[PDB]
Design a binder for this molecule. Structure first.
Ligand SMILES: N[C@@H](Cc1ccc(O)cc1)C(=O)O
Length: 455
């Protein structure tokens, strides 16, 4: 193997990136002034008197998120309109000036506390774009204000798992375009919350860039480093193939994808969209596609102006969670005999329920493969396979075969990348065994789990 391949096959996640990956799916909570004014885009300078939801019940939100199987929640602490959901000391444009809770409330506190009681991690979105704040457009003075608010959020509310950042901007009242001192912002986050992943407009987690309803066929976590300050764009179908990254040499990095979408057409709640909430089945397919396609899933659910998650959203979440649990429960009810093409001693690692142990074929194994034999003919429609990503991402082509009770065997399906998890789906079939052929790989693959199941 050449220097380049030895490099690519060993690019690896940091501690914070690995912990983040293991979350799999978490929620976004869009709630604030835009909810009250029924907008996707706020104008700024909205009257704080308009923020007076009568029945905020964050435990109702968290209850539904747990039932949905979420690992954490990212709250919109301040959106583009600039209204802050905590009583910031740096602006009067906050819940402290609203009639909500007699001006004595702190929704960031209320949410973070409830998240922790519910076993969910807590993250923040603090909008760089600010349509109210006076310093906006002045340059450094707005950076000072932003950093000031980051500091409040990152020091007063306990551990933060993610700081989510988009890059929208505009002109201030002075007519000048505000640009952000990203490097300065990153230092603050790294300093105050070392374990947090800085996401999207940050170096730790990449916006998947997919068209809604689509995920990459091949999602590589190892990609050109230039994608971190985002010729090539985040929306390209092929970011990480050998051909795509060839010319970049060592200028690549571990920069894993996050698929983000809303359960409704809009990010904020609009009553007119109450008949347009994704169903539990739509969410499940999404989960299977994202979390079964080497991407984390960020799912937005917006509370209504009353201060509750709406009934359809709660039901979809509940059904999503039920489908995910049924899937895992069947993935454990599975009785299989695992056999490998080499390193049979390590074959045990495929089924010990330890994500830290893996099977890796011998260097001279020219056809690495895992055979799973079933106690008797069973119907299956998917295989689950996971790489030991702590050590990198390597698999490039996977071919799955099934041995039918009727002597013969056929191809059940193929896939490219695996990474954190590949759930390969196909038509319901009855087999006595399946073989996973790792036809292509950057050096020897390290596989921590393999399984055949019926969804
Ligand atoms: N393209 C999206 C990105 C985004 C999504 C959610 C946000 O809260 C902020 C930004 C938008 O601006 O609408």
């Amino acid at each position: 193997a050449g220097i380049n391949l030895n490099y690519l096959a060993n690019v690896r996640p940091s501690s914070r990136q690995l912990a983040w990956q293991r979350m799999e799916m978490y929620a976004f909570l869009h709630f604030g002034m835009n909810t009250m004014t029924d907008r996707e885009w706020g104008l700024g300078h909205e009257d704080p008197a308009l923020f007076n939801p009568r029945n905020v019940d964050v435990d109702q939100w968290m209850d539904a998120l747990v039932a949905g199987g979420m690992a954490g929640v990212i709250l919109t602490c301040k959106h583009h309109d600039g209204f802050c959901l905590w009583p910031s000391r740096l602006t009067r444009h906050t819940v402290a000036s609203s009639p909500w809770r007699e001006g004595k409330g702190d929704l960031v506190r209320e949410v973070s506390e409830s998240a922790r009681r519910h076993g969910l991690k807590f993250g923040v979105y603090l909008s760089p774009w600010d349509r109210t704040e006076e310093s906006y457009g002045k340059g450094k003075a707005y950076d000072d204000f932003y950093v000031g608010q980051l500091t409040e959020l990152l020091t007063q509310y306990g551990p933060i798992f993610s700081v989510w950042l988009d890059g929208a901007n505009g002109e201030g009242k002075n007519g000048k375009t505000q640009y952000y001192d990203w490097d300065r912002y990153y230092n603050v986050i790294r300093s105050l919350q070392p374990d947090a992943v800085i996401s999207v407009c940050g170096p730790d987690v990449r916006w998947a860039g997919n068209e809604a309803g689509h995920v990459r066929d091949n999602e590589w976590s190892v990609v050109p480093r230039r994608l971190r300050s985002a010729t090539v764009s985040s929306q390209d179908d092929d970011l990480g193939s050998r051909e795509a990254v060839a010319g970049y040499g060592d200028n690549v990095c571990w920069y894993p994808a996050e698929v983000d979408t809303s359960i409704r057409p809009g990010w904020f709640y609009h009553q007119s969209e109450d008949d347009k909430v994704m169903s539990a089945d739509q969410l499940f397919d999404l989960w299977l596609s994202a979390v079964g396609g080497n991407s984390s899933l960020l799912l937005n659910i917006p509370p209504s102006p009353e201060g509750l998650l709406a009934e359809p959203d709660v039901q979809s979440l509940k059904g999503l969670g039920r489908r995910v649990s049924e899937f895992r429960e069947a993935l454990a009810s599975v009785r299989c005999e695992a056999r490998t093409s080499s390193a049979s001693a390590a074959a045990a690692h495929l089924v010990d329920g330890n994500r830290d142990t893996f099977w890796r074929p011998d260097a001279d194994d020219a056809a690495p493969a895992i055979t799973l034999t079933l106690p008797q003919p069973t119907t299956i429609n998917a295989i689950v396979i996971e790489e030991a990503i702590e050590h990198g991402q390597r698999i490039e082509h996977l071919r799955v075969t099934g041995a039918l009770p009727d002597g013969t065997e056929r191809v059940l399906g193929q896939a490219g990348t695996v990474g954190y998890r590949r759930i390969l789906r196909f038509d319901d079939v009855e087999v006595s065994s399946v073989t996973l052929h790792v036809d292509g790989s950057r050096l020897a693959p390290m596989i921590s789990r393999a399984a055949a199941v019926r969804i």
